[PDB]
Design an enzyme around this catalytic site. Structure first.
Site, PDB file in Angstrom:
ATOM      1  N   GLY A  16       0.724  -1.273  -0.044  1.00 20.66           N
ATOM      2  CA  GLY A  16      -0.311  -0.192   0.139  1.00 20.66           C
ATOM      3  C   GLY A  16       0.850   1.054  -0.175  1.00 20.66           C
ATOM      4  N   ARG A  54      -2.745  13.634 -11.780  1.00 16.82           N
ATOM      5  CA  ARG A  54      -3.351  14.555 -11.098  1.00 16.82           C
ATOM      6  C   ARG A  54      -3.571  14.410  -9.690  1.00 16.82           C
ATOM      7  N   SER A  76      -7.926  16.301 -17.654  1.00 15.28           N
ATOM      8  CA  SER A  76      -8.705  17.693 -17.471  1.00 15.28           C
ATOM      9  C   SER A  76      -8.182  18.691 -16.930  1.00 15.28           C
ATOM     10  N   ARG A 118       1.070   1.524 -12.490  1.00 17.77           N
ATOM     11  CA  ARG A 118       0.711   0.412 -13.228  1.00 17.77           C
ATOM     12  C   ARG A 118       0.802   0.644 -14.643  1.00 17.77           C
ATOM     13  N   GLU A 281      14.524 -17.370  28.251  1.00 17.80           N
ATOM     14  CA  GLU A 281      15.739 -18.107  28.375  1.00 17.80           C
ATOM     15  C   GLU A 281      16.679 -17.180  28.800  1.00 17.80           C
ATOM     16  N   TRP A 303      15.115 -26.200  26.708  1.00 14.87           N
ATOM     17  CA  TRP A 303      16.072 -27.204  27.549  1.00 14.87           C
ATOM     18  C   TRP A 303      15.530 -28.371  28.121  1.00 14.87           C
ATOM     19  N   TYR A 329      24.952 -21.203  31.939  1.00  9.62           N
ATOM     20  CA  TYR A 329      24.818 -20.038  31.776  1.00  9.62           C
ATOM     21  C   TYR A 329      23.838 -19.421  32.697  1.00  9.62           C
ATOM     22  N   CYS A 389      27.755 -22.867  24.721  1.00 15.44           N
ATOM     23  CA  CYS A 389      27.987 -22.621  23.413  1.00 15.44           C
ATOM     24  C   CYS A 389      28.228 -21.347  23.156  1.00 15.44           C
ATOM     25  N   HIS A 390      27.695 -20.394  23.554  1.00 19.59           N
ATOM     26  CA  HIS A 390      28.303 -18.805  23.664  1.00 19.59           C
ATOM     27  C   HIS A 390      28.947 -18.774  24.915  1.00 19.59           C
ATOM     28  N   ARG A 410      31.471 -21.302  20.336  1.00 24.85           N
ATOM     29  CA  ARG A 410      32.285 -22.382  20.082  1.00 24.85           C
ATOM     30  C   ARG A 410      31.140 -23.242  19.101  1.00 24.85           C
ATOM     31  N   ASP A 413      24.385 -23.933  16.257  1.00 24.19           N
ATOM     32  CA  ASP A 413      23.440 -24.784  15.266  1.00 24.19           C
ATOM     33  C   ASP A 413      22.400 -23.715  14.647  1.00 24.19           C
TER      34      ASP A 413
HETATM   35  N1  LIG Z   1       3.757   5.983  -1.036  1.00 23.43           N
HETATM   36  C1  LIG Z   1       4.112   6.749  -2.370  1.00 23.43           C
HETATM   37  O1  LIG Z   1       5.345   6.504  -2.745  1.00 23.43           O
HETATM   38  C2  LIG Z   1       3.037   7.504  -3.395  1.00 23.43           C
HETATM   39  C3  LIG Z   1       1.779   7.626  -2.887  1.00 23.43           C
HETATM   40  N2  LIG Z   1       0.743   8.200  -3.353  1.00 23.43           N
HETATM   41  C4  LIG Z   1      -0.505   8.163  -3.115  1.00 23.43           C
HETATM   42  O2  LIG Z   1      -1.639   7.398  -3.920  1.00 23.43           O
HETATM   43  C5  LIG Z   1      -2.798   8.208  -3.703  1.00 23.43           C
HETATM   44  C6  LIG Z   1      -2.617   8.609  -5.068  1.00 23.43           C
HETATM   45  O3  LIG Z   1      -2.606   7.762  -6.310  1.00 23.43           O
HETATM   46  P1  LIG Z   1      -4.103   7.356  -7.230  1.00 23.43           P
HETATM   47  O4  LIG Z   1      -5.321   7.113  -6.251  1.00 23.43           O
HETATM   48  O5  LIG Z   1      -3.760   6.240  -8.065  1.00 23.43           O
HETATM   49  O6  LIG Z   1      -4.227   8.574  -8.197  1.00 23.43           O
HETATM   50  P2  LIG Z   1      -3.155   9.228  -9.410  1.00 23.43           P
HETATM   51  O7  LIG Z   1      -1.915   9.847  -8.319  1.00 23.43           O
HETATM   52  O8  LIG Z   1      -2.440   7.944  -9.931  1.00 23.43           O
HETATM   53  O9  LIG Z   1      -3.634  10.317 -10.240  1.00 23.43           O
HETATM   54  C7  LIG Z   1      -4.698   9.762 -11.066  1.00 23.43           C
HETATM   55  C8  LIG Z   1      -5.146  10.831 -11.986  1.00 23.43           C
HETATM   56  O10 LIG Z   1      -4.080  11.016 -12.799  1.00 23.43           O
HETATM   57  C9  LIG Z   1      -4.959  11.065 -14.214  1.00 23.43           C
HETATM   58  N3  LIG Z   1      -4.622   9.959 -14.901  1.00 23.43           N
HETATM   59  C10 LIG Z   1      -4.062   8.666 -14.454  1.00 23.43           C
HETATM   60  N4  LIG Z   1      -3.998   7.836 -15.495  1.00 23.43           N
HETATM   61  C11 LIG Z   1      -4.531   8.644 -16.796  1.00 23.43           C
HETATM   62  C12 LIG Z   1      -4.670   8.250 -17.993  1.00 23.43           C
HETATM   63  N5  LIG Z   1      -4.277   6.786 -18.541  1.00 23.43           N
HETATM   64  N6  LIG Z   1      -4.956   9.090 -18.939  1.00 23.43           N
HETATM   65  C13 LIG Z   1      -5.276  10.171 -18.662  1.00 23.43           C
HETATM   66  N7  LIG Z   1      -5.154  10.616 -17.259  1.00 23.43           N
HETATM   67  C14 LIG Z   1      -4.803   9.741 -16.272  1.00 23.43           C
HETATM   68  C15 LIG Z   1      -6.228  11.164 -14.019  1.00 23.43           C
HETATM   69  O11 LIG Z   1      -6.521  12.480 -13.640  1.00 23.43           O
HETATM   70  P3  LIG Z   1      -7.737  13.171 -14.087  1.00 23.43           P
HETATM   71  O12 LIG Z   1      -8.768  13.389 -12.884  1.00 23.43           O
HETATM   72  O13 LIG Z   1      -7.649  14.383 -14.650  1.00 23.43           O
HETATM   73  O14 LIG Z   1      -8.405  12.425 -15.297  1.00 23.43           O
HETATM   74  C16 LIG Z   1      -6.391  10.418 -12.582  1.00 23.43           C
HETATM   75  O15 LIG Z   1      -7.465  10.947 -12.002  1.00 23.43           O
HETATM   76  C17 LIG Z   1      -2.657   9.227  -2.960  1.00 23.43           C
HETATM   77  O16 LIG Z   1      -2.980   8.794  -1.760  1.00 23.43           O
HETATM   78  C18 LIG Z   1      -1.264   9.517  -2.873  1.00 23.43           C
HETATM   79  O17 LIG Z   1      -0.761  10.124  -1.816  1.00 23.43           O
HETATM   80  C19 LIG Z   1       1.135   9.152  -4.530  1.00 23.43           C
HETATM   81  C20 LIG Z   1       2.383   9.192  -4.947  1.00 23.43           C
HETATM   82  C21 LIG Z   1       3.225   8.487  -4.393  1.00 23.43           C
HETATM   83  N1  LIG Z   2      21.890 -29.620  19.930  1.00 24.76           N
HETATM   84  C1  LIG Z   2      21.292 -28.489  20.396  1.00 24.76           C
HETATM   85  N2  LIG Z   2      21.074 -28.243  21.990  1.00 24.76           N
HETATM   86  C2  LIG Z   2      20.548 -27.132  22.429  1.00 24.76           C
HETATM   87  N3  LIG Z   2      20.355 -26.783  23.627  1.00 24.76           N
HETATM   88  C3  LIG Z   2      19.735 -25.593  23.769  1.00 24.76           C
HETATM   89  C4  LIG Z   2      19.642 -25.117  22.671  1.00 24.76           C
HETATM   90  C5  LIG Z   2      18.876 -23.831  22.029  1.00 24.76           C
HETATM   91  C6  LIG Z   2      17.432 -24.242  21.653  1.00 24.76           C
HETATM   92  C7  LIG Z   2      16.629 -25.345  22.033  1.00 24.76           C
HETATM   93  C8  LIG Z   2      15.626 -25.233  21.421  1.00 24.76           C
HETATM   94  C9  LIG Z   2      15.291 -24.464  20.380  1.00 24.76           C
HETATM   95  C10 LIG Z   2      13.924 -24.608  19.509  1.00 24.76           C
HETATM   96  O1  LIG Z   2      13.361 -25.919  19.124  1.00 24.76           O
HETATM   97  N4  LIG Z   2      13.182 -23.712  19.417  1.00 24.76           N
HETATM   98  C11 LIG Z   2      11.749 -23.663  18.832  1.00 24.76           C
HETATM   99  C12 LIG Z   2      11.822 -22.654  17.796  1.00 24.76           C
HETATM  100  C13 LIG Z   2      12.685 -23.511  16.546  1.00 24.76           C
HETATM  101  C14 LIG Z   2      12.997 -22.531  15.394  1.00 24.76           C
HETATM  102  O2  LIG Z   2      13.603 -21.996  15.235  1.00 24.76           O
HETATM  103  O3  LIG Z   2      11.938 -22.689  14.744  1.00 24.76           O
HETATM  104  C15 LIG Z   2      10.917 -23.196  19.930  1.00 24.76           C
HETATM  105  O4  LIG Z   2      11.139 -23.495  21.144  1.00 24.76           O
HETATM  106  O5  LIG Z   2       9.784 -22.258  19.780  1.00 24.76           O
HETATM  107  C16 LIG Z   2      16.069 -23.543  19.837  1.00 24.76           C
HETATM  108  C17 LIG Z   2      17.120 -23.190  20.503  1.00 24.76           C
HETATM  109  C18 LIG Z   2      19.952 -26.133  21.515  1.00 24.76           C
HETATM  110  C19 LIG Z   2      20.183 -26.421  20.179  1.00 24.76           C
HETATM  111  O6  LIG Z   2      19.750 -25.479  19.393  1.00 24.76           O
HETATM  112  N5  LIG Z   2      20.866 -27.412  19.897  1.00 24.76           N
HETATM  113  O1  LIG Z   3      22.299 -21.110  22.716  1.00 18.17           O
HETATM  114  C1  LIG Z   3      22.411 -21.954  22.019  1.00 18.17           C
HETATM  115  N1  LIG Z   3      23.030 -22.151  20.451  1.00 18.17           N
HETATM  116  C2  LIG Z   3      23.371 -23.080  19.874  1.00 18.17           C
HETATM  117  O2  LIG Z   3      23.745 -22.776  18.838  1.00 18.17           O
HETATM  118  N2  LIG Z   3      23.294 -24.295  20.449  1.00 18.17           N
HETATM  119  C3  LIG Z   3      23.529 -25.515  20.093  1.00 18.17           C
HETATM  120  C4  LIG Z   3      24.949 -25.903  18.970  1.00 18.17           C
HETATM  121  C5  LIG Z   3      25.022 -27.485  19.043  1.00 18.17           C
HETATM  122  O3  LIG Z   3      24.060 -27.666  17.980  1.00 18.17           O
HETATM  123  C6  LIG Z   3      24.505 -27.720  20.264  1.00 18.17           C
HETATM  124  C7  LIG Z   3      25.538 -28.151  21.262  1.00 18.17           C
HETATM  125  O4  LIG Z   3      26.207 -29.295  20.533  1.00 18.17           O
HETATM  126  P1  LIG Z   3      27.594 -29.653  21.219  1.00 18.17           P
HETATM  127  O5  LIG Z   3      27.682 -29.714  22.664  1.00 18.17           O
HETATM  128  O6  LIG Z   3      28.422 -30.586  20.475  1.00 18.17           O
HETATM  129  O7  LIG Z   3      28.530 -28.297  20.915  1.00 18.17           O
HETATM  130  O8  LIG Z   3      23.819 -26.673  20.936  1.00 18.17           O
HETATM  131  C8  LIG Z   3      22.701 -24.495  21.932  1.00 18.17           C
HETATM  132  C9  LIG Z   3      22.431 -23.322  22.546  1.00 18.17           C
HETATM  133  F1  LIG Z   3      21.932 -23.642  23.747  1.00 18.17           F
END
Ligand SMILES: NC(=O)C1=CN([C@@H]2O[C@H](COP(=O)(O)OP(=O)(O)OC[C@H]3O[C@@H](n4cnc5c(N)ncnc54)[C@H](OP(=O)(O)O)[C@@H]3O)[C@@H](O)[C@H]2O)C=CC1
Ligand SMILES: Nc1nc2[nH]cc(Cc3ccc(C(=O)N[C@H](CCC(=O)O)C(=O)O)cc3)c2c(=O)[nH]1
Ligand SMILES: O=c1[nH]c(=O)n([C@H]2C[C@H](O)[C@@H](COP(=O)(O)O)O2)cc1F
Ligand SMILES: NC(=O)C1=CN([C@@H]2O[C@H](COP(=O)(O)OP(=O)(O)OC[C@H]3O[C@@H](n4cnc5c(N)ncnc54)[C@H](OP(=O)(O)O)[C@@H]3O)[C@@H](O)[C@H]2O)C=CC1
Ligand SMILES: CN(Cc1cnc2nc(N)nc(N)c2n1)c1ccc(C(=O)N[C@@H](CCC(=O)O)C(=O)O)cc1
Ligand SMILES: CN(Cc1cnc2nc(N)nc(N)c2n1)c1ccc(C(=O)N[C@@H](CCC(=O)O)C(=O)O)cc1
Ligand SMILES: Nc1nc2[nH]cc(Cc3ccc(C(=O)N[C@H](CCC(=O)O)C(=O)O)cc3)c2c(=O)[nH]1
Ligand SMILES: O=c1[nH]c(=O)n([C@H]2C[C@H](O)[C@@H](COP(=O)(O)O)O2)cc1F
Lengths: 508, 508
Positions: A16, A54, A76, A118, A281, A303, A329, A389-390, A410, A413
């Site tokens: 947007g 415009r 216009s 567009r 943690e 853990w 830790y 580990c850290h 050291r 994971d």
């Molecule tokens: N976040 C950002 O970077 C930017 C955001 N904006 C926002 O977007 C909004 C405005 O955009 P939007 O709603 O799309 O309107 P526009 O800014 O695209 O202006 C549209 C107007 O330009 C004229 N026009 C467009 N196309 C044609 C065409 N093919 N031939 C002839 N005339 C044309 C028409 O004027 P006429 O009425 O004369 O026909 C039309 O009503 C605002 O909220 C603005 O603040 C705007 C710029 C940048």
């Molecule tokens: N071999 C091994 N031993 C560990 N002891 C402690 C940790 C840290 C740890 C442990 C579990 C998770 C874990 O499974 N986390 C999930 C999110 C997993 C993810 O990143 O998707 C959660 O509990 O929400 C993450 C870090 C850890 C690890 O990563 N590996």
């Molecule tokens: O904070 C952590 N960060 C991390 O990377 N590990 C992982 C690293 C490794 O996969 C495992 C320890 O295995 P090892 O004892 O062989 O180092 O724990 C565990 C944590 F608690």
């Protein structure tokens, strides 16, 4: 033949861009981004044209933009030649007359709402897209940005920024065309002579089929790539190795990751990470607790695997209770070198409270180089249900009062532990920063045995197929007196729009 | 208009290439390098021409090279057309008629000794140089390679390799000519909007005036750049900070370095490193010793600063003897958590012998992830004359029986401590590898407070002006029963040709 770029700020999911004739948000830095992109030109005696509809022309107050020529597409509006910085055309196709004829215009920018976006993409007028993804989705929109066509490929994804607790990215999309040069050949030939003797072959670049969003080559600024590219690097160079469990891994040595915490929170977006279990943690460690039931009582079973009676007796801890994990830790943090009896005894006063000394050192001597909190204690390793580990972490106070963190791991994971260790030590740094009075800084994680368990292959390969989204924001709802006072209700996670969760089993 | 490259293998210093009509060495991989470089072509129906002098033509047995046309420059050889793979010209200029006339030739390669090298460079016929620097200089030469003119600039420097204990590099030099594009602009504009909020600005790329050999952009393979580029990054982003001493530093957080030990030894070449003092410090640690006099008795005064009676009483250790450093490196290694009295008492049996457990674990359980040796003990930090800088290290056995090492360093004196820590843990890894039966692997050093002391600025900027040379080889002369049996006479440093030593004072 000149350049036609699109500048747009769209929502991260629904794309947007507007509501009721205005923007759904107010981000000051984004408007400054629009300023510099549309003003960036090479010729001093030239100006860039900004095409808009415009309705958009009305939204910006119907006033010209400095140093730029605004092209309004209105059916216009009076084509008055009085204002030289604003010109009106009837349709978008006829408005692209400046490419071949108007040599006074350098670049062209499309930025005029859905009707212009567009129509510019359906007629293949666009060469590049400057997308500003915004992490706002629980609001209303009436004007959207069209789906990016297959002809475009992302080439850049900036780091996650923050304005009024709103995360946003900056991306660049380039259209595909058709179908230093000597340095690459010489390195390849050296790779054919020395097999794995050349260190480059031991660290091969990940192939395209395992590289997350491989179209983004030089613009991998987003710091979730610091984790996703480590997955790719393990898949390419990981050696199939055994371990203490039955699940073998693919392991590489000596890897690092680097995350920003100033403008974002390093919570992965390519998979819904159980953020609550990460916190429970962490606060479990801070409190000095080693009771495994206290996490199970809070419906956190991370853990539970390493804390089953069958596992403890298997590793020589039959005398231990069900979930008495031992001095781990949170026992070396608060009671270092303390004679560990069981998980029910009172350890207040025994040991060396590293965390307390760390907090007191962080505020009294911030530029000290010894802000270290270790968990590797060889005297108590035999008592532990699982060695740390850290192992060791070090903290750093910058000159602008920011708290950065370094961590050595050291064993990592990458399937489960790494997503937790990234967020866990990020929250711990933020906790230390608030209690000490600083702001969060950078987080660097140094890894030894970075590996992927073989039952995580199909899952992590699915995670690599998901182009990442901006990091969310994590802010605390109240300032706490002591560090252990944090509660789960005190955390506010803002703008977390991840990909569906991915189930992976832990190797016990 | 085609390319004319020169291929040469010269000595590292004097640039000698031959003696008595043959090569001064016998490196098999270098000849294979010559094979692939001269054969690398794009057109299947084309051949590369190899230009050489008669004396060189005699040196290779006067026999043609496969898939190539050899051009011999001789003043008195018969221009015989019987062999189509060998042609003779009278002078070098007339032999360069393959550029305009003979379109069946793709590339041209000059490789025919001093008389051809000097004439090819003096007449500006060369476009690129393929230099194979060899670490052999205390032998005799009679034919040298001319000094590379200022018009050429290095663009690539390979990692240091090894053949029969001979280190060698591969470099590319290109001649200077005259004087993705959108991604760099967008990153610059984001740096103008977010000041230090964007993490990229906190890690700015080093400027050209502090980049070592800034001509080598994409070919910084030589792993001494892992240290030289850390210096550049500190000079660029280092924040002026105070510390426990009077000498302020420029410090950055969370940096890493990576070195190869299979084919080289990471001893810096841009500065003559006191290799003996490095060893005597390391064997001092291994033996379990904390007596500072044992290093001074061996003429090693590195720990004399932190062991002066004035310094110990300054940090609250006035009761301590002259150089009684206390429980430090080598006391947490061999007697972890051992009650330290003085440096004269007998500590045999007390504490946790981490090194012994580390050695026993390295050969009995190679795929174990707990090959950790820590030195950070909060219970004994107050007794230490200086807390450990290299706090924790982890070791790793690859599938090809190589021993890699990871090290975390809390504080890094890039002027003095860093060159020592690179070699110290490289030797320690090699020592552990021999005692355990493995080969040396990779060395990774992870750093927290990487800094440069302000009195080292003029020196380190001088060190950055020296283009680095191939790493030397360090081999052991005998297999030892126990690790503590190593002696300085057991080490052989092969091919170390560094730049002059640089004097830098230590901050006490
Ligand atoms: N976040 C950002 O970077 C930017 C955001 N904006 C926002 O977007 C909004 C405005 O955009 P939007 O709603 O799309 O309107 P526009 O800014 O695209 O202006 C549209 C107007 O330009 C004229 N026009 C467009 N196309 C044609 C065409 N093919 N031939 C002839 N005339 C044309 C028409 O004027 P006429 O009425 O004369 O026909 C039309 O009503 C605002 O909220 C603005 O603040 C705007 C710029 C940048
Ligand atoms: N071999 C091994 N031993 C560990 N002891 C402690 C940790 C840290 C740890 C442990 C579990 C998770 C874990 O499974 N986390 C999930 C999110 C997993 C993810 O990143 O998707 C959660 O509990 O929400 C993450 C870090 C850890 C690890 O990563 N590996
Ligand atoms: O904070 C952590 N960060 C991390 O990377 N590990 C992982 C690293 C490794 O996969 C495992 C320890 O295995 P090892 O004892 O062989 O180092 O724990 C565990 C944590 F608690
Ligand atoms: N390490 C390496 O990469 C290489 C090393 N080498 C070594 O270098 C040594 C040989 O080189 P080097 O001693 O300099 O002798 P050269 O290889 O340069 O050959 C010289 C001969 O080429 C002919 N020649 C040279 N210049 C001219 C000219 N301007 N006009 C006409 N004829 C010319 C002459 O032949 P003529 O007698 O007919 O007059 C001359 O004697 C050997 O030891 C060899 O092993 C050689 C190549 C590569
Ligand atoms: C057409 N439009 C809507 C609008 C709002 N945000 C966007 N954001 C992005 N990333 N891209 C767009 N095309 C975009 N468009 C605009 C155009 C200009 C200004 C504007 O005020 N520009 C001033 C910016 C003032 C400042 O520097 O902050 C300028 O100097 O150009 C606002 C909304
Ligand atoms: C002219 N010359 C001397 C010589 C020796 N070493 C060098 N080394 C380098 N890096 N560059 C040179 N120009 C060079 N030249 C040569 C040329 C070819 C062969 C040679 O035997 N080439 C075989 C190589 C055989 C193999 O594969 O090992 C080939 O197939 O080209 C040896 C010496
Ligand atoms: N603040 C501080 N304390 C330290 N304690 C021990 C070291 C390591 C160290 C100490 C002294 C030297 C030293 O003076 N070495 C010289 C040459 C210095 C060099 O040019 O590398 C030598 O031993 O010959 C080197 C490393 C060290 C350091 O760097 N800084
Ligand atoms: O092996 C060593 N490596 C090293 O880098 N230092 C330097 C780092 C820093 O400059 C100083 C310790 O200062 P601090 O205790 O404040 O960290 O010693 C010392 C060693 F012995």
């Amino acid at each position: 033949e000149k350049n036609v770029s699109i500048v747009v700020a769209a929502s991260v999911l629904s794309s947007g861009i507007g509501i009721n004739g205005q923007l759904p948000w107010s981000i000051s830095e984004d408007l400054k981004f629009f300023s510099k992109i549309t003003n960036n030109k090479c010729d001093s005696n030239k100006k860039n044209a900004l095409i808009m509809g415009r309705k958009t022309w009305d939204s910006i107050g119907r006033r010209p933009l400095k140093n730029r020529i605004i092209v309004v597409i209105s059916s216009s509006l009076p084509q008055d030649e009085a204002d030289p910085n604003v010109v009106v055309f009837r349709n978008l196709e006829d408005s692209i007359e400046n490419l071949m004829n108007d040599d006074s215009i350098e670049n062209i920018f499309v930025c005029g709402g859905e009707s212009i976006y567009r129509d510019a993409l359906k007629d293949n007028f666009v060469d590049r897209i400057y997308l500003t993804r915004v992490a706002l989705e629980d609001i209303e929109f009436d004007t959207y940005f069209p789906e990016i066509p297959e002809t475009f490929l992302p080439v850049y994804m900036s780091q996650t920024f923050c304005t009024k607790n709103i995360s946003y990215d900056f991306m660049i999309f380039e259209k595909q065309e058709k179908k230093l040069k000597s340095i690459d050949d010489t390195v390849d030939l050296l790779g054919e002579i020395f097999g794995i003797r050349k260190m480059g072959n031991r660290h091969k670049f990940p192939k395209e089929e395992i590289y997350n969003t491989p179209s983004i080559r030089f613009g991998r600024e987003h710091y979730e790539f610091q984790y996703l590219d480590l997955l790719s690097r393990v898949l390419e160079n990981g050696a199939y190795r055994e371990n203490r469990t039955g699940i073998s891994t693919y392991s590489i040595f000596g890897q690092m990751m680097r995350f920003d915490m100033r403008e974002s929170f390093p919570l992965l977006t390519t998979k819904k990470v159980a953020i609550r279990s990460i916190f429970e943690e962490l606060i479990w460690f801070i409190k000095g607790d080693t009771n495994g039931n206290h996490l199970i009582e809070k419906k956190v079973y991370i853990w539970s695997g390493n804390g089953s009676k069958e596992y403890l007796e298997r590793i020589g801890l039959g005398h231990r209770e069900e979930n008495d994990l031992g001095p781990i830790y949170g026992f070396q943090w608060r009671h270092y070198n303390g004679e560990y009896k069981t998980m029910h005894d009172d350890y207040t006063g025994v040991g060396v409270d590293q965390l307390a000394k760390l907090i007191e050192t962080l505020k009294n001597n911030p530029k000290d180089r010894r802000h270290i909190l270790t968990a590797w204690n060889p005297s108590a390793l035999s008592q532990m249900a699982l060695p740390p580990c850290h192992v060791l972490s070090q903290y750093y106070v910058t000159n602008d009062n920011c708290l950065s963190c370094n961590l050595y791991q050291r064993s990592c994971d990458l399937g489960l532990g790494s997503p937790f260790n990234i967020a866990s030590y990020a929250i711990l740094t933020m906790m230390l920063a608030q209690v000490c009075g600083y702001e969060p800084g950078e987080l660097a994680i140094f890894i030894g045995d970075a590996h992927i368990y073989e039952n995580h292959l199909t899952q992590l390969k699915e995670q690599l197929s998901r182009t990442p989204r901006p990091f969310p924001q994590l802010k605390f709802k109240r300032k706490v007196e002591n560090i252990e006072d944090f509660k789960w209700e005190d955390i506010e996670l803002i703008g977390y729009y991840p990909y569906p969760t991915i189930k992976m089993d832990m190797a016990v």
